[PDB]
Amino acid sequence: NTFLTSSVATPPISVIRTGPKWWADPERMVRQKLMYFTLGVDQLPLRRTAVIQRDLQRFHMCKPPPRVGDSTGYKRSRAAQLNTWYRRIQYQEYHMQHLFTRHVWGLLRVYPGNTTKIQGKADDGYVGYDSVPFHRYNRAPLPFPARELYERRK
Amino acid sequence: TTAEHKQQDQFYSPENQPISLHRNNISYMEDVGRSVKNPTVPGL
Amino acid sequence: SLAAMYMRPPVTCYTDACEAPVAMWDGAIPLKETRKLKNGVPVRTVSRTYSHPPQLTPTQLSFNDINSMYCVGNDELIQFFPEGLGGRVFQTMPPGHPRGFLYRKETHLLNLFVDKVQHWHTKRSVLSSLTNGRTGFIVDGPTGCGKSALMCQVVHFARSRNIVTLYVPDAKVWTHGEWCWPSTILPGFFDAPDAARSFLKYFAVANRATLTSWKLRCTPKDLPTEQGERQPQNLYELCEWGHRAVAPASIDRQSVCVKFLMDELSEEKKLPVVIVVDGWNLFSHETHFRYPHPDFLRGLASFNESSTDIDLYPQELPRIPASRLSFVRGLNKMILSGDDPNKFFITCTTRDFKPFDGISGFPNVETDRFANSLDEYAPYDPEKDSHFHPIQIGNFDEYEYRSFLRFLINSGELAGLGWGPLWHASSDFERKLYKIGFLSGRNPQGVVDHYHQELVWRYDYQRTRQKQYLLKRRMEGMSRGA
Amino acid sequence: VSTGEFDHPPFQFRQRHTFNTTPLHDANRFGGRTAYLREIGPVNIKKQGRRFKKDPRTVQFNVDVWCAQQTLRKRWKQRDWEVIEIPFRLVPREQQRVIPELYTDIPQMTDPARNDFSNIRNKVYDREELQGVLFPAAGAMLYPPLQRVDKQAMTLDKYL
Amino acid sequence: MQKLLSPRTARHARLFRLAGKLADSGSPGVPKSDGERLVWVNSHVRRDKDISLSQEEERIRELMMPL
Amino acid sequence: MQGGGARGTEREVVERLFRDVVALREELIEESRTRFGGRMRVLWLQEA
Ligand SMILES: Nc1nc2c(ncn2[C@@H]2O[C@H](COP(=O)(O)OP(=O)(O)OP(=O)(O)O)[C@@H](O)[C@H]2O)c(=O)[nH]1
Numbered sequence A: 001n002t003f004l005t006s007s008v009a010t011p012p013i014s015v016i017r018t019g020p021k022w023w024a025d026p027e028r029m030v031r032q033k034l035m036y037f038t039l040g041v042d043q044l045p046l047r048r049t050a051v052i053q054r055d056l057q058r059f060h061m062c063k064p065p066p067r068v069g070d071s072t073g074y075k076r077s078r079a080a081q082l083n084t085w086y087r088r089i090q091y092q093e094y095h096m097q098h099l100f101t102r103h104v105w106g107l108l109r110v111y112p113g114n115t116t117k118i119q120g121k122a123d124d125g126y127v128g129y130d131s132v133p134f135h136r137y138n139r140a141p142l143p144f145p146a147r148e149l150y151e152r153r154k
Numbered sequence B: 001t002t003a004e005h006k007q008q009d010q011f012y013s014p015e016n017q018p019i020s021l022h023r024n025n026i027s028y029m030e031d032v033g034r035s036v037k038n039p040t041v042p043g044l
Numbered sequence C: 001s002l003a004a005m006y007m008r009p010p011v012t013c014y015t016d017a018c019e020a021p022v023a024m025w026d027g028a029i030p031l032k033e034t035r036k037l038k039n040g041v042p043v044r045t046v047s048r049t050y051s052h053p054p055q056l057t058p059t060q061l062s063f064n065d066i067n068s069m070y071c072v073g074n075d076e077l078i079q080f081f082p083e084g085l086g087g088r089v090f091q092t093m094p095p096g097h098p099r100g101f102l103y104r105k106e107t108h109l110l111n112l113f114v115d116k117v118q119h120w121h122t123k124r125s126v127l128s129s130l131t132n133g134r135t136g137f138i139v140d141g142p143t144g145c146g147k148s149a150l151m152c153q154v155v156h157f158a159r160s161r162n163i164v165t166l167y168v169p170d171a172k173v174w175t176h177g178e179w180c181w182p183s184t185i186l187p188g189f190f191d192a193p194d195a196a197r198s199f200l201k202y203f204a205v206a207n208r209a210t211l212t213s214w215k216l217r218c219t220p221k222d223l224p225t226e227q228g229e230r231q232p233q234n235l236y237e238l239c240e241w242g243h244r245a246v247a248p249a250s251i252d253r254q255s256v257c258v259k260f261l262m263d264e265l266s267e268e269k270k271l272p273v274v275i276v277v278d279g280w281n282l283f284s285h286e287t288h289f290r291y292p293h294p295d296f297l298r299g300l301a302s303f304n305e306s307s308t309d310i311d312l313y314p315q316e317l318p319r320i321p322a323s324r325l326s327f328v329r330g331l332n333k334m335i336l337s338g339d340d341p342n343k344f345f346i347t348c349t350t351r352d353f354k355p356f357d358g359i360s361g362f363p364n365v366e367t368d369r370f371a372n373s374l375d376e377y378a379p380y381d382p383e384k385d386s387h388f389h390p391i392q393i394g395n396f397d398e399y400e401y402r403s404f405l406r407f408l409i410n411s412g413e414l415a416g417l418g419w420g421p422l423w424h425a426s427s428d429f430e431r432k433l434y435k436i437g438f439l440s441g442r443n444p445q446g447v448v449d450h451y452h453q454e455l456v457w458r459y460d461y462q463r464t465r466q467k468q469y470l471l472k473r474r475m476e477g478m479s480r481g482a
Numbered sequence D: 001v002s003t004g005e006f007d008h009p010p011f012q013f014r015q016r017h018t019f020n021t022t023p024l025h026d027a028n029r030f031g032g033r034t035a036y037l038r039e040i041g042p043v044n045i046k047k048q049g050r051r052f053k054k055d056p057r058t059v060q061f062n063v064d065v066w067c068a069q070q071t072l073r074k075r076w077k078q079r080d081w082e083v084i085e086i087p088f089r090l091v092p093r094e095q096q097r098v099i100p101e102l103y104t105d106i107p108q109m110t111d112p113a114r115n116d117f118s119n120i121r122n123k124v125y126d127r128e129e130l131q132g133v134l135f136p137a138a139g140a141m142l143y144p145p146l147q148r149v150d151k152q153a154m155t156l157d158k159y160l
Numbered sequence E: 001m002q003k004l005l006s007p008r009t010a011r012h013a014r015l016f017r018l019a020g021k022l023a024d025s026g027s028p029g030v031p032k033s034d035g036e037r038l039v040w041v042n043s044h045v046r047r048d049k050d051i052s053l054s055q056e057e058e059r060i061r062e063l064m065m066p067l
Numbered sequence F: 001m002q003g004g005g006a007r008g009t010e011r012e013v014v015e016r017l018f019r020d021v022v023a024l025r026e027e028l029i030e031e032s033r034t035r036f037g038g039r040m041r042v043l044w045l046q047e048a
């Protein structure tokens, strides 16, 4: 991993709201798929996501279907329910990506960006060479040189 | 039918058999169980 | 949907075990009811339309099998390839998946050739005419056709038939390496110590059977040894002695050991030896190492005035030619000297270089497909640049291409690695085949690549219009029932 | 037809390290050259900075020099050859003509009558065919002659 | 044991004869050699058996489609 | 020959057949690559 510096975390929903621009950008989604496939694990959530989003993109310039007014509000609530389903289908994916990426990085002897967990290796966030001399969230002092997660041979 | 009808009218259009003309349609359906009521914790 | 009726066709292979639960592949690979006759007119048996390609030993592959797909068992894969596989070959073979190989017509040619090498002394005239006097072949083509794969297959054919086989799975581990030491006992030559060590390791464990029978005609019987260790009497024993040591000792040991190993190989005239090198074209020009600036050799008082620039400015010194690598020296020695018709080089080319079109920006580091490619940008002609007989390889023709794609998709789905329950989202096989043809140009690496990318196709309308028609038909049926 | 970046990103609100976004002078752009352009830290505008490092035209010029180096570098790694200056007599039949200087005439075909159409400019000669010409002094040939492949010979690819 | 090279089915035989006839009219791109012609014929027959497979898998898929 | 146990069939007749069969097969193979514009080459490649 080349990008090492401390970062700003964005809530999952705003990441998903980027649609085609980032979250569903074809290019990105394909190399996620590559990671999964190479690990020998089906990519179902990715495929659900890709389906939902593919279709989002196809109809993205159309006006929504005409609404008739109801005291029930069954329509509004069914649209909502469907929507939060899709949101959750994608939360699951977003989680999977962060999960597997961290795990794979643990196998590749990769050091993550500052303040990032790698389950077996760095439990509290890993940090080295931050702009700030302490670990940001522990409030503990950082050693020089940067802490090493892996034994030396390569 | 008229050869004209079968030359010009035998294609998919918003008249004939349109693909959905509207936003926010159902992309993905599956057979699944229902989740618990209010699975989300109210927070912070 | 004939799912719960489905039993599983009992397991003989690694390959037959690669099948996932029915629930996963059910729509994707459709079931059918076949009525045969036992004890009652039928007894309904549910079979799947598709099954993984057969798992076939190299000796079972026949002329009749060309352009078909065959599988390699996982443990045969472990037996025959402890070095690794060719450059990208393993990208089609994740852990659950079956290990496929398209048996091409050139594959059959080299299979015949190797099967003759097995007893060469009888077939000497035949062989020599088949290469036209050169020592083996170099296979060349565009980036991403079957080259590295073809080499894999040759290693498989050779090692299954119990021939002694050097396999260098990627030449770039030598010539474009981690680091480069001057060799210990060969003045003026160089080593790639890491390449060399790993080689000495896997070579030994692959050929161990034959290499333990091999007695040393020339190696010193005095080799330096730690207390409680044994003087090697075999070629295997020697290779062992090469890589089993604590570093730094491994480094000088490996030099000595490679020199003597190659000296031993060139001295064996009766036992067929097949040398497979992937990316020979890296061995025929310079390595990316440069000779150390001479001021590293002369010792120094201050940088202040020695009349030395080594600290001020970087500069390029002439590259070290690969022929000055002690290993490559060994091989060249066997190629160029006549009176060695014991040895067969079946060797390969790699075009894996970074793209350069006349301007280069800086590569975006997030999106770069070429980050692990070489910097080369200089042309290579197998005719002028090697002593081997060149054989050319193209992209798949449609017969190959179809068999290969069918494999990637369907045996992928059977292994639970593909659309699965979502199968109705992707288009039918024919459409995928035609489209992936257009996108890939039928280049094999392109086919693999676009097969993955298919996940993202926007503009495919087939399943949409089909779904629509099936619906209309169901509703007319419901209006006729009414 | 390169995919690489040839343009420095425009100055805006401070970019931060995010999904989908990195800092402007981040170490990952232009192969880490951005070091040269970087003012580290929460820069105090009034008192501190180096003006040229925020200037669009200047910054872009620097980046353009760096790109030029990249291309030059790769064009030279691409050469396997030297230019030797050989007297008119001793040169192969194709160069016995007049050869307009670069960008002077239409890009020129080596030998249309013999069915070779290619830039004479970029035609490269083998050091082994020019041996007699380049090292006349040496007596015995220094490089051993190229061995060539019989394309009429029955070999593995002809299915015999 | 051994396999035979010569055409196995009546189908192979028929296509093999066709390929011969094409070779004798000297049309462009046709294999001159009998081995190549065999490989060609086998490969073709196999391709058509594949096409039939995909058509069957389609007819079956059509019934279990979601809507 | 070598599996029959050398129980005499007039073993020399067997070996005579062997040498003859071999001679004809060689002749036929090499002929298959040489003759008829080499059309039958792959017989030679396969079995030689
Ligand atoms: N099973 C099988 N797969 C193949 C065959 N040829 C190509 N492939 C697949 O397609 C990919 C083609 O990549 P390589 O074979 O590594 O390409 P290459 O010719 O070595 O090209 P460079 O190394 O880039 O010069 C391989 O990784 C295989 O997965 C083949 O003959 N049989």
Ligand SMILES: [Mg+2]
Residues within 6 Å of the ligand: C086, C087, C088, C147, C148, C349, C350, C351, C352
């Ligand atoms: Mg390769």
